Each structure stands twice: as C-alpha cells, then as structure tokens.
Design a protein around this ligand. Structure first.
Ligand SMILES: *[C@@H]1O[C@H](CO)[C@@H](O)[C@H](O)[C@H]1NC(C)=O
Ligand SMILES: *[C@@H]1O[C@H](CO)[C@@H](O)[C@H](O)[C@H]1NC(C)=O
Ligand SMILES: *[C@@H]1O[C@H](CO)[C@@H](O)[C@H](O)[C@H]1NC(C)=O
Lengths: 51, 409, 368, 49
C-alpha cells in the first residue's frame, strides 16, 4: 500500500492494505508490513518485532 | 430617509411604522412598505419601481408565508447588491447567504441552521462523551456543518483524555428509500451517539428505517437540529430524542422591532458621518454605486443596540445574530419537556426528567468495543502460507518435525 | 422552425449575424434558427428582463445568446436567476468579466466562455517549462481560487518527473493592509526569479508600487499573472514594468461574429440531438410574469446534450462550471511601449512559440 | 534601513553609534521585529553611559 493521487482530482488515497485499514474494512494489520515515514503519518505502530 | 421592507404581515406595515415613530427620538426617517408576490420576478421589479426609485437607503425582508421558501430572499437580495446596498435579513436561516463572496450585500438578524451545530460541541462537557458519528445530506448544508464541526474539533495544543474524535461521517441524497444500508453499516461501529442534520421528510425516512433496525433501543443518544422536531418527523421520531429550539425565532414582530431599533442606532451613527454620497439612480443609471455601502456595513459592524425583545443582539463577522440564546428540549411520549438553559455558551443547568430512549436514567457512555476484529493479511512466504482446503471444507492436518500440530486457521 | 434570439451591447456588427447564419451546416440547421437581434443600450437589468420575456413571448424563443461589452460585469447572476425562472439556456458569449465568475447553481443553465482558473494555471506551468524557468513563488489574497489555485499547482508539483521548486505561498489580506510596512517587510522573503500573482486591478498597482521599493523590478526578474487582473482593456498603470506576461485569448481575436456562429451552432445542434432522441422539447415557457410550474412540467435534461457538441470542424465540451473544455489560448507580453504584443499560442496541451529566448554575466559554452 | 535590517538572522547583534540616532534605530528595530523576544543587544557603553 502506497499513497497515490487518483480521480484525476486533488485527492490521494491508498490502494493496498492500508486502504482497507483506514476505510473501516479492517481494524488491524498483521503481516510483513514495513515501517516508514508516510505510513507513520496516519497509523500507529507497535514496537517492532523483527529487526 | 425612506426604508422599505417586503414583509408578510399587512399589519406589520403599521407595526414597524410605529417602530419608526418610536425610534424618531434619536432628522426625517420616512417609512416605505410593500407586500409580497409569488414569482420573485415581480418582486424585484417592484423593488426597482418603488424603493430603488425612492433612492434613499437600506431595506428589509422576512420569510413569506411559504415555509421553506429558501429562494425567496435571493432575487431582491442581490438586486440591490448590484449597487452595494447593504440589506438585512429577518427570518430565513438557509446557510447559502453565509457566503460573502456571491453576496457582499447581506447581513442577518438570526443564526443559520448549520450554525446551530456549534452548540453540540458542548453537550459532552456535561455528558462526558468522546465518540460520535455524523449523518448529513449531500448538499452544501451538510458540508457547512461538517467544516464547522471539524474546526470546532480543533486539537487543543498540549504541553490524559484529549477532546472528542469524529468517526466515519456518512452521506445520503434526498428522497431515497433504502438508506438502511448505511445504518446497518454504522450498526457495527464502536460508538452509540448520533447526530443527524437534514430536511424534514428525510428524517422521517431515517426514523422508519432505524426503528426497523432496532437501532433506537437502549444505550443510544440523538441530537438533531431544528428541522426534525417538526411534526412530519414528530410522526416518526422515537421518544428520548433530544432537540433544540431557537427562542423567539418564529415570532416576526419582535424581531421587526429589534431591526428597526438597530437601524435607528445605525442612522444616528449616520447623521454625523462625512462624505455622504448619493443613494442609487432609480434602477436606471445602472453603472454607479451609492458609495457608502461598504461604510454602511462597517458602521453596522458595532451598532451595539444593547437589548430588544430577545435581549442583546450583536453580530458575528458575517452580519448575523451572534449570541442568541435558546432552549433545549426532549421528546417524552409525544410531550415536549423543555429545558431552556442555553444562554449562549453558558452551560445549561435545568431541572426535569431527562429520559433516554431505553427508558433508563443513567447517562450511558456510548462506548463498547471488545468485539471481533476483522483482521487483514497479505500472502507472503515465510510469514503466511495460503493453502486450499480439502473437499471436506477444512484443510489437511499436518505435524512438525517433532510432530506438533501446526495450528492453522 | 425555432426561436433563437440573440442580443449585443455597444457594437454594430449587424451582418455578423446574417452572414454567419448563411454559413450554417445544412446537416445541423434542421431546426432553422430564426435568428433575431436587438441592441439595448446596456442600461437596466430590469430592462434586460423586460426585453427577455418580451421576445420570449414574441417568438416562443427557446434560448438566447447574450453579449456583453462593459468590463463592469458582475451580472451573470441575473441571467442565472432567469434560468431559475425560465428553463432555457443562455450563453455569456463575450464582454467584460461576463464569462469568468464562479456563479454556481444547480437548476441553472448559464454557460460562460473562456477558461477556468485551473486550465489557465496549467498553461502557465507549460510555458514555464518550455523556457527552462524552474523556481518560483506565489502571492495572492482572498479570491475564490486561493486554496483552489495553490492546491491545483502544488498537486502537479507533487508528481515531479522534473526538477521544480516551491518556496512559499504568500497569503495576504486584500483591502486591509492599514500598515503597508507589513508588505514592505514580508515581500523581502522572495528569492526566486519567477513570481506569480493573483489579485484585483487596483491593489495590483498598489503592490507593483511597493515592489518598486522592495527591489523586485525588471532587473532580471519576470512576472506573469493570469489575465484576470488585467485584460485587453490596455489601461496600463505606470507601476507595471514591461515584461508582464499572461494568457488572455478568451475573446481576443476569436471573432465576435464567429462567436455568434459557435453559439447558434451548439444550441441548434443540441436541439437536433434532442429530437434525435425523440426528445424534442419544442415547448418554451408561456410568459415571464407567468412562467410558473403551471407551465414548468419537466426539467431541462437536454444538458445531457449541452455538455459536448462538435460542428463546423470544432469541438466544444463542458464541465460543471460551463467553460469550454478545450479553449484556444494565447500568451502575450508587456512591451516597453506599454503595448500588448502576442507572443505564443497554446492549444491541445501544446505550445507554439517564436523566440527560444527572453531578453555581462551571460556566457556561451561549447563541448563535445 | 527598514528593508536592510531584515537581513539579520543571528541571535546576537552589536551596535556602534551616537546616542540620538541610537533611539532612532531602536525605533526602526521595534518595527523590523528585532526586539526582546529571544534576541539580545550589547553596545560598548559609548552610546549610553
Ligand atoms: C430497500 O429498502 C428496504 C426497506 O425499505 C430494505 O429492506 C432493502 O434492503 C433496501 N434495498 C434493497 C436493494 O431492497
Ligand atoms: C411575539 O411578539 C409579540 C409582540 O407583540 C408578543 O406579544 C408575543 O408574546 C411574542 N410571541 C408570540 C408567540 O407571539
Ligand atoms: C459526447 O459525449 C457522449 C458520451 O459518450 C457521447 O454523445 C459522445 O461521446 C460525445 N458526442 C459526440 C457527438 O461524439
């Protein structure tokens, strides 16, 4: 999941897992999900569990 | 001077005529009057023909007998605006005029509907709540209420519990009938309060649907605007709902008087100003401006007419009744338990039998969470394996190198 | 037969009507627009209304093409109210601002010409690239496009396949700078060679003047502003230094005769498309004072045809705004003669120039 | 000066002048923003004693 403009309008959404995290379809992601900056903007992160 | 108005009540003519007569004690201020007409075209034409031709000063107008009549102001509204003639409004609350851009000519006497939601920023400060949902229409009204709530949810910059946080706000188009898909949607959410801002009939639709979903039982809250206590919904809403009434709203004459008084204070502030230019050119010299409209609004800025029937009526930065108190109330078996305790941002300490829908008396925290958790996960090799089940429905059972049961789900 | 009334103000291009009528496509004239002209002396909105319904009753006019001439044009809203009265469409063919404003309403069918704020911004960036400018800043205060304009241009920055630079958006306050020292100090924070400005016409000269102080002048800088602080009115206040560039081909040489041509074209073609869908609506309103819902039976769904129409080898599409989806724009420049000379021609997401250049620390290097 | 005294960015400034033009520049500094917010000023006792 990444943060992409769409609609050819001024909006940018996420496809991908994080999309279904924010829109309510889900409520916790458990997978090999990386850490980053942007992702840390709209989500909270537990402490890591495998460096 | 000559001020006119298009007001419904014929007797209101004599009313505000006497109002001029009373304000006379603080200079000719002749009165002009005119009835209504259905197709606003004839209205604006009468505007030019009489009051613009009079070519003196400002103008008033209230709601006609038409209940909604959301359009009735506009024509005559920006008609004179074409010459920057500051005009005041009486009884219409639709929020479009709130824009200065397409209407640089318009002040009011009354707050707009979408303004009312500001008060809801407070009901948790007595009912300590933090979690909400929204149901607004798809027009501008909802968007307005929404921006207003958003900014009222300004995060109090810190350095424990920190403010209330909104949830998925939803939308809907008028006249629909299968709105249920939304509600059942929300039904699975993790809060229990609601806010609903819409027209009349739509509300009744929602009432029907929700009562069908039984989403109106115990442990629930509601806080609708004004357009829902109305009967068409009063034929559908459940008890225990909370609503609120703008005090002295639907009373014309008192507001009439306040208006006359404010403009009287204005003109007494006008009788001694400088560079007094000329009222318009009878709707024919249609190039110029009575180049005082700007200053006319700017003097209408602080016309602190300290008290009328509704008491102190001072303005916002959008020329609107800025601090008008009003009443909270409750439906209680078709009955209207009044709690008239909101005097502006003052807290609201009444005394009666608040009854929430479930009939309890507790003020339940609309909170509940320990549910299922719809978890997601992507295929990827040494962390998650995907395998097809057997024809039975489950998948085959295996064992580790030592032989332990490799749990599967 | 159909009633297609038109109107102008302040011009005599009479044959510009019947001539363009003789140049009508025989495949599109199947509704034979009974063209009719009147010339009021641009006097009274009330007069406008009078005449409007006068001719409507006179020839069952199912649509008008208004024309304007004064720069002083806030008046679209009137026609919009007319649409709110009569269910006929209306074309703000030309004039002053008579094709620009953002008058937004639902049950209306008024349509402007010229471009939006957005497509203007786009051509702006285009010409900004084709001459290798790469750094700029912005300055504006309180106009319906502000948080629109910034978002539009920055949201095309954020897909940077090329190098760009956004220094700062300079939000200001229109007609409130009691202390002009505030701008004298704030407008120092510029450092880019390129600035873009959005404002009125008067405060424009005011800021030009303060710029004459802060140092931002025709030394090595440049300035471009989207033709809606200044137009073909060519009343250049002193404070403009030569070199101002903009794009204002909205009605520059498009041809008011050709304008009325395109008007009649799109409208009668839409009528053709509706009667092609068996949906000819040959019933106009009955009377102005009596245009009530008693006559108003079904709304104007022929917008499903008005959106896009191609004829005479030209295509005209429309957005919810109502400007042409594919304008034909041109870029002009403020010369020393305080005269506007056309420079470039933009069309079809494409540019056409003549210069490669924009006139001792400038050198000529070779390599291999 | 209203324009030139913008080019400051350091927290510390040193000044050398008369006594009157001193007040004059102090005044213009009251405008440019260089005031007792977080800045400081030191001058060698021969504009003021
Ligand atoms: C339509 O509304 C009914 C009740 O009014 C509801 O049961 C149904 O789910 C809605 N949608 C459809 C597709 O029937
Ligand atoms: C409205 O104003 C009138 C003023 O004559 C006053 O008598 C009355 O109590 C007010 N309220 C209603 C509901 O009429
Ligand atoms: C206008 O758009 C519609 C949508 O497809 C359709 O009529 C067509 O693509 C366009 N018109 C013409 C004449 O091609």
């Amino acid at each position: 999941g990444t943060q992409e403009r769409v609609q050819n309008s001024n909006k940018k959404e996420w496809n991908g897992m994080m999309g279904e995290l924010l829109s309510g379809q889900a409520d916790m992601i458990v997978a090999p999900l990386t850490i980053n900056n942007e992702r840390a903007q709209y989500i909270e992160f537990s402490k890591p569990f495998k460096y | 001077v000559n001020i006119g108005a298009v007001l419904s009540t014929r007797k209101h003519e004599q009313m505000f005529r006497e109002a001029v007569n009373q304000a006379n004690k603080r200079i000719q201020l002749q009165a002009t009057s005119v009835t209504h007409k259905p197709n606003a075209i004839q209205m604006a034409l009468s505007v030019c023909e009489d009051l613009i031709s009079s070519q003196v000063y400002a103008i008033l107008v209230s709601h006609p007998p038409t209940p909604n009549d959301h359009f009735t102001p506009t024509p005559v509204s920006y008609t004179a605006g074409f010459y920057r003639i500051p005009v005041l409004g009486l009884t219409t609350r639709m929020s479009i005029y709130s824009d200065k851009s397409i209407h640089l000519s318009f002040l009011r006497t009354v707050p707009p509907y979408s303004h009312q939601s500001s008060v809801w920023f407070e009901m948790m400060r007595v009912y300590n709540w933090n979690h909400i949902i929204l149901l607004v229409s798809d027009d501008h009204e909802g968007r307005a209420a929404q921006k207003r709530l958003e900014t009222l949810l300004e995060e109090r910059e810190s350095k424990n519990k920190r403010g209330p946080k909104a949830e998925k706000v939803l939308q809907f188009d008028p006249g629909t009938k299968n709105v249920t898909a939304l509600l059942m949607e929300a039904r699975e959410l993790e809060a229990r309060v609601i806010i609903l801002s819409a027209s009349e009939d739509d509300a009744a639709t929602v009432y029907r649907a929700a009562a069908m979903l039984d989403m109106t039982g115990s442990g629930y809250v509601w806080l609708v605007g004004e357009r829902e206590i109305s009967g068409n919904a009063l034929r559908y809403a459940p008890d225990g709902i909370i609503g609120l009434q703008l005090i002295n709203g639907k009373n014309e004459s008192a507001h009439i008087s306040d208006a006359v008084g404010v403009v009287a204070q204005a003109v007494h502030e006008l009788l001694e100003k400088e560079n007094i230019t000329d009222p318009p050119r009878g709707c024919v010299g249609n190039t110029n401006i009575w180049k005082t409209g700007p200053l006319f609004k700017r003097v209408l800025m602080s016309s602190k007419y300290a008290d009328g029937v509704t008491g102190r009526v001072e303005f916002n930065e959008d020329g609107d009744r800025k601090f008008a108190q009003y009443s909270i109330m409750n439906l209680q078996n078709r009955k209207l338990v009044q709690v008239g305790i909101y005097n502006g941002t003052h807290v609201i300490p009444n005394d009666r039998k608040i009854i929430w829908p479930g009939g309890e008396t507790e003020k339940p925290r609309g909170y509940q969470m320990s549910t299922r958790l719809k978890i997601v996960t992507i295929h990827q090799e040494p962390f998650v394996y995907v395998k097809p089940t057997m024809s039975d429905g489950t998948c085959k059972e295996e064992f580790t190198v030592n032989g332990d049961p490799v749990k599967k789900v | 037969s159909i009633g297609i009334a038109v109107i102008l103000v302040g011009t005599s291009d009479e044959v510009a009507i019947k001539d363009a009528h003789e140049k009508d496509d025989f495949h599109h004239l199947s509704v034979v627009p009974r063209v009719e002209l009147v010339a009021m002396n641009e006097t009274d909105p009330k007069s406008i209304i009078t005449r409007i319904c006068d001719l409507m009753s006179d020839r069952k006019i199912q649509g008008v093409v208004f024309a304007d001439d004064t720069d002083q044009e806030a008046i679209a809203q009137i026609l919009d109210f007319i649409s709110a009265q009569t269910l006929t469409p209306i074309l703000g063919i030309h004039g002053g601002s008579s094709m620009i404003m953002a008058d937004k309403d639902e049950s209306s069918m008024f349509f402007q010409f010229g471009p939006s704020i957005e497509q203007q911004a786009s051509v702006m960036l285009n010409i900004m690239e084709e001459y290798d400018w790469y750094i700029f800043s912005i300055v504006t205060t309180y106009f319906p496009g502000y948080q629109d304009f910034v978002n539009k241009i920055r949201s095309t920055i954020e897909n940077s396949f090329v190098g760009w630079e956004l220094e700062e958006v300079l939000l200001l306050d229109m007609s409130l700078d009691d202390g002009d020292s505030k701008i004298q100090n704030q407008l120092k924070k510029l450092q880019s060679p390129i600035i873009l400005l959005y404002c009125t016409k008067e405060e424009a000269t005011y800021i030009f003047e303060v710029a004459n102080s802060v140092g931002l002048t025709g030394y090595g800088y440049t300035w471009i502003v989207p033709s809606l602080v200044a137009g073909d009115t060519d009343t250049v206040p002193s404070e403009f230094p030569t070199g101002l560039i903009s794009v204002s081909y909205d009605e520059w040489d498009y041809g008011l005769p050709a304008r009325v041509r395109d008007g009649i074209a799109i409208i009668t073609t839409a009528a053709s498309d509706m009667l092609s869908e068996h949906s000819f609506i040959p019933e106009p309103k009955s009377s102005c004072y009596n245009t009530h819902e008693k006559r108003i039976y079904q709304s104007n769904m022929l917008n499903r045809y008005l959106i896009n129409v191609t004829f005479e080898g030209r295509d005209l599409s429309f957005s919810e705004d109502g400007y042409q989806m594919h304008p034909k724009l041109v870029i002009i420049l403020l010369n020393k003669e305080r005269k506007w000379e056309r420079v470039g021609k933009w069309k079809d997401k494409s540019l056409q120039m003549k210069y490669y250049v924009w006139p001792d620390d400038h050198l000529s290097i070779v390599t291999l």
